[PDB]
Amino acid sequence: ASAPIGSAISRNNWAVTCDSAQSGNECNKAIDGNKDTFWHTFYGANGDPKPPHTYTIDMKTTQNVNGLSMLPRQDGNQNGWIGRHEVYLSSDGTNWGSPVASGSWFADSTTKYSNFETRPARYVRLVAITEANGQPWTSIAEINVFQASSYTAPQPGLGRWGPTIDLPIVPAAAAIEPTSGRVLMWSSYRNDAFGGSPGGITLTSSWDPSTGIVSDRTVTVTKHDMFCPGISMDGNGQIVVTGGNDAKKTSLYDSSSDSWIPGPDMQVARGYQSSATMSDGRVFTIGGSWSGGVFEKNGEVYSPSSKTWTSLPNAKVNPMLTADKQGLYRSDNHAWLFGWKKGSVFQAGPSTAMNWYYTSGSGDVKSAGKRQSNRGVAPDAMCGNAVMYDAVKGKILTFGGSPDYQDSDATTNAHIITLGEPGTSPNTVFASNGLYFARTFHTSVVLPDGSTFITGGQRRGIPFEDSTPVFTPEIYVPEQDTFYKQNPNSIVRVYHSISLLLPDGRVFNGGGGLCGDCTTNHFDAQIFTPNYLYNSNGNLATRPKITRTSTQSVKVGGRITISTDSSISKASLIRYGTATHTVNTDQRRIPLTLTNNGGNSYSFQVPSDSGVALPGYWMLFVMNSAGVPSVASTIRVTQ
Ligand SMILES: [Cu+2]
């Protein structure tokens, strides 16, 4: 199940309008309180007019609207189930503006929801863009609108939340499709659950930022239920999904052909492991005792060229284990892995002990010292985040998490780790005064300007429960070594939530739950628009445009020349990300040194070390003097 974020508004004085309604299935049958009566558009003798179909409500009075619910027909028939939809709010019933929520609902008879940020309105409109099974009709058994206890206008300069993207699944795992710019998401064998899996199936859903279209696909070709996996984007640009519900499987997503290809089985069966793309384009993985059994799972490496997995038994997992109360089942999970120089992989945590992993021969491991500062030794930070915001300077920001995976208090601990050469112990310091809010199960992304956006989580880790939620996101600004609170949201994002940086510079935050009959399933996502996209007047700022690029494929050490429509002051390369269970080993940022050729013509060199400039797809962002970024131009980097 799921749940609304607000309280049901009294429907006694409501006036409703529908584009069409069959006799016996009147527009008002959707607000009569009878679950067995429904509104249904024209059919039979009246003909079968295709979508869009609309349901408009006049609430007579202004309400602080934060959602709606839609109960479909409960008679066992599927005709009219709403698929793609849009929700609009208004104060006059004439001017509707932009949708406060849009997307698609799953094809079943369960109550569907649209949860969004509070907005005062008198009129509500639900537009059915498509029927769930492509049929011409629209039907609704019961429709309700919800309200918050109050409304507080967002603070100027602290970004904005909205709109909500309604989904047919809980997006517990996600990635940005490089060549299409779409957000790929997946759950498990079911749209709302993972338990009781027969294996061999994954339900996926994609959202296109340019069209707003949500599409789905059931993946069975790879014979893999991709829930709880390791995720990496290889040197060629294929998404390598490993283990999970089907512990020994590897599934490959190809962006260019928009298809899933069967990959080679891993040498060891794993679940909850972290995988990381290397300097040579290969993928390294270690640990992962959630599935496949609880035992010593050392490293192994994937080669995209030969489509093989090879064991690296001497790349020992023992040095990176946390002291989790639940033991090995949890202690080898979600390592903070980063591909580095000469085929090495840095492990920043969650364990206090940081390590260097080597991939030559049968593998090796070397101690990199303990994550610490002048404030003391950092405790184990399970499900804490780690973000490489400046790969050129080897800067990694780590924050949050708890000593144990569950039933443990999260902390405000935050550190800055500075990587040097492989085998050397990196210098580590405390980041500012730490987080404003202690949190675990939170997610994060590095933004074009080098700042790190942190959102969601809870003060005490209790998987599948929406207790002690943190609604206020935080942004770390490196130049000032300061954290800044942003405008809060209204949807709890805890266990099974994700965050990814979109090609337009905004943040996609969603998921949470995936517990079947629980009421904590969140079949949605929200868009966060950072302050850098707004001008002083509170309106969306004019963005600089990249009018031309010399090439879209470059080798490390190579140069790229661009043309713009206006003057730019700064530029950066951000590697496309992947995300699940707080892990994102693909994203990283490279600040660029620009050469002004005169006028609106610029050049830059991609770092020569492929350990810094990890091969694969990257987003090119250019910022003007005001700090407003352009939309991303896609660049492929090779070693
Ligand atoms: Cu999980």
Supply the DSSP string of 262-316, one letter for each residue: E-PPPSS--BS-EEEE-TTS-EEEE--BSSS-SS---EEEEETTTTEEEEETTS-
Scanning the structure block, which residue is given the tokens 């972290």?
274
Classify domain 542-639 at the CATH topology level: Immunoglobulin-like (2.60.40)
Q: What is the CA radius of gyration of the chain?
A: 25
Measured in whole angstroms, how far is the alpha carbon of residue 33 from the centre of its chain? Answer: 37
Distance separating alpha carbons of residues 389 and 155, to the nearest angstrom:
27
Residue 135 Cα to ligand 1 midpoint, Å, equals: 35
Q: Is 581 annotated as belonging to a binding site?
A: yes
Ramachandran region of residue 376, left (φ > 0), alpha (ψ -120 to 50) or beta?
left
Ramachandran region of residue 187, left (φ > 0), alpha (ψ -120 to 50) or beta?
alpha
> Among residues 43, 253, 302, 495, which one is catalytic?
495
Residue 137 Cα to ligand 1 midpoint, Å, equals: 37
Q: Is 602 annotated as belonging to a binding site?
A: no
357 is catalytic: no
Residue 521 Cα to ligand 1 midpoint, Å, equals: 13
Tell which CATH classification among 3.40.605.10, 3.40.120.10, 3.60.15.10, 2.130.10.80 matches the domain 154-541: 2.130.10.80
Residue 496 Cα to ligand 1 midpoint, Å, equals: 6
User: Domain 1-153 is classified in which CATH homologous superfamily?
Assistant: Galactose-binding domain-like (2.60.120.260)
Distance separating alpha carbons of residues 537 and 539, to the nearest angstrom:
6
Quick count: other Cβ atoms within 10 Å of Cβ 80? 25
- Record the tokens describing residue 504, joined without a space: 């337009």
- Record the tokens describing residue 181, joined without a space: 């710019």
Q: Is 40 annotated as belonging to a binding site?
A: no
Scanning the structure block, which residue is given the tokens 């510079």?
505
In the sheet that holds 578-580, the strands lie side by side as: 214-219, 202-207, 182-186, 173-177, 578-580
Distance separating alpha carbons of residues 315 and 312, to the nearest angstrom:
6
Q: Say whether the peptide bond before residue 350 is cis (omega within 30 degrees of 0).
A: yes
Q: Which residue stretches of 34-180 are H helix? A: none
Residue 81 Cα to ligand 1 midpoint, Å, equals: 30
Distance separating alpha carbons of residues 485 and 499, to the nearest angstrom:
17
Distance separating alpha carbons of residues 271 and 365, to the nearest angstrom:
22
- Given a contact cutoff of 8 angstroms between Cβ atoms, the answer to whether 558 and 573 are in contact is no
Q: Give burial (CB, 10 Å; 0-12/13-18/19+) of 19.
A: middle
Q: Is 495 annotated as belonging to a binding site?
A: yes
DSSP 611: T
Beta partners for 64? 120
Q: How far is CA 168 from CA 193, 194, 202, 450, in A?
A: 12, 15, 13, 33
Quick count: other Cβ atoms within 10 Å of Cβ 120? 13
Q: Dihedral sign, CA of 209, 158, 488, 116? A: negative
Of residues 443, 424, 627, the one with CA closest to residue 533: 627
Dihedral in degrees, nearest 10, Cα atoms 232, 224, 334, 300: -70
- Given a contact cutoff of 8 angstroms between Cβ atoms, the answer to whether 470 and 412 are in contact is no
Residue 474 Cα to ligand 1 midpoint, Å, equals: 24
The total number of residues written for the chain in this structure: 639
User: In this structure, which long-range contacts are made by residues 15-23, counting pairs with CB atoms below 8 Å and at least 24 apart in sequence?
Assistant: 15/57, 15/58, 15/60, 16/55, 16/56, 16/57, 16/58, 17/54, 17/55, 17/56, 17/58, 18/53, 18/54, 18/55, 18/56, 19/49, 19/52, 19/53, 19/54, 20/46, 20/49, 20/53, 22/46
At 575, give phi and psi (nearest 5°): -65, 135
Scanning the structure block, which residue is given the tokens 């260019």?
256
Residue 464 Cα to ligand 1 midpoint, Å, equals: 9
Of residues 11, 126, 12, 17, the one with CA closest to residue 80: 126
Instruction: State the structure-solving technique.
Output: X-ray
E-strand spans in 304-433? Answer: 308-312, 337-339, 345-347, 353-358, 364-370, 372-373, 376-377, 385-390, 395-399, 414-418, 427-430
Domain residue limits, the chain? 1-153, 154-541, 542-639
Distance separating alpha carbons of residues 628 and 544, to the nearest angstrom:
7
